[PDB]
């Protein structure tokens, strides 16, 4: 999306330090705990009654890594988020029936997790670039809904 070069490169450099497996697990887990209604898509994952059960759930963890893996591969296509996520947008709509507002919630949770991990390094300008990224991904994921 409308990303400044200093912004594009702030995103990229930070992302190179991210452990996708850990962040993925943490982002999805936090989504389920903070906004409990998002659990509606994951009844088959098992016990999600408490935060500890959610955060320790291996299916939550593995799904988080999958989701962030796809997000990660999308950061190499910032000039074409729409085409990169098109088939995923269709699947989310036609097969999974996921309200796109969930993509927005995950984005903001993701931004909180990055702040939690990187502390001082996640400065106000770095946040603003990631907010643009997460909204761009959300919008690309919702683009094929009908």
């Amino acid at each position: 999306v409308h990303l400044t070069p200093e912004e594009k490169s702030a995103v990229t450099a930070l992302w190179g330090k991210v452990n996708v497996d850990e962040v993925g697990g943490e982002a999805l887990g936090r989504l389920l705990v903070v906004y409990p209604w998002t659990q509606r898509f994951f009844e088959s994952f098992g016990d999600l009654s408490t935060p500890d059960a959610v955060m320790g759930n291996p299916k939550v963890k593995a799904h988080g890594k999958k989701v962030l893996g796809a997000f990660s591969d999308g950061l190499a296509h910032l000039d074409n988020l729409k085409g990169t996520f098109a088939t995923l947008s269709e699947l989310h709509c036609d097969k999974l029936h996921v309200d796109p507002e969930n993509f927005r919630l995950l984005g903001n949770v993701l931004v909180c997790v990055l702040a939690h991990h990187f502390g001082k390094e996640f400065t106000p300008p770095v946040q603003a670039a990631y907010q643009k990224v997460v909204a761009g991904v959300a919008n690309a994921l919702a683009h094929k809904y009908h």
Binding site: P36, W37, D99, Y145
Partner: protein, 141 residues
């Protein structure tokens, strides 16, 4: 909070809806499904074609729930308790969707009640639907 004047306006406007409630509920849903297609994600099990029986049936249910709230306007959290539980624990509809249905209900009332949909009444109905939405979303977390 609803004011005495709000309550009067809502009872009057809903009074004129009368025995049209069901029809108007189904119309509000069709408007929502076409203007805001993401709302369709919550009804994958319905036939959503124009005039669908599932849509008419659901319209009546929504409309009856609103009629109940108006009948109990001084005690809505208790009158809608069961529905509040259902949305929070089973249906789990994202809160943003309530604003979308509310708007479509207002458009529907405006389209059918030209004499009664004055600025003051529009204002009170919008506040009323926001209060219903709040109650229905109150137990989410």
């Amino acid at each position: 909070v609803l004011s005495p004047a709000d309550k009067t306006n809502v009872k009057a406007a809903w009074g004129k809806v009368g025995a049209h409630a069901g029809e108007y509920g189904a119309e509000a849903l069709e408007r929502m499904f076409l203007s805001f297609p993401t709302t369709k994600t919550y009804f994958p099990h319905f036939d959503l074609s124009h005039g669908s029986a599932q849509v008419k049936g659901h319209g009546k249910k929504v409309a009856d729930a609103l009629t109940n709230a108006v009948a109990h306007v001084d005690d809505m959290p208790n009158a809608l308790s069961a529905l509040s539980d259902l949305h929070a624990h089973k249906l789990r509809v994202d809160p943003v969707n309530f604003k979308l249905l509310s708007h479509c209900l207002l458009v529907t009332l405006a389209a059918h009640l030209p004499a009664e949909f004055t600025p003051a009444v529009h204002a009170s109905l919008d506040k009323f639907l926001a209060s219903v939405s709040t109650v229905l979303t109150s137990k989410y977390r």
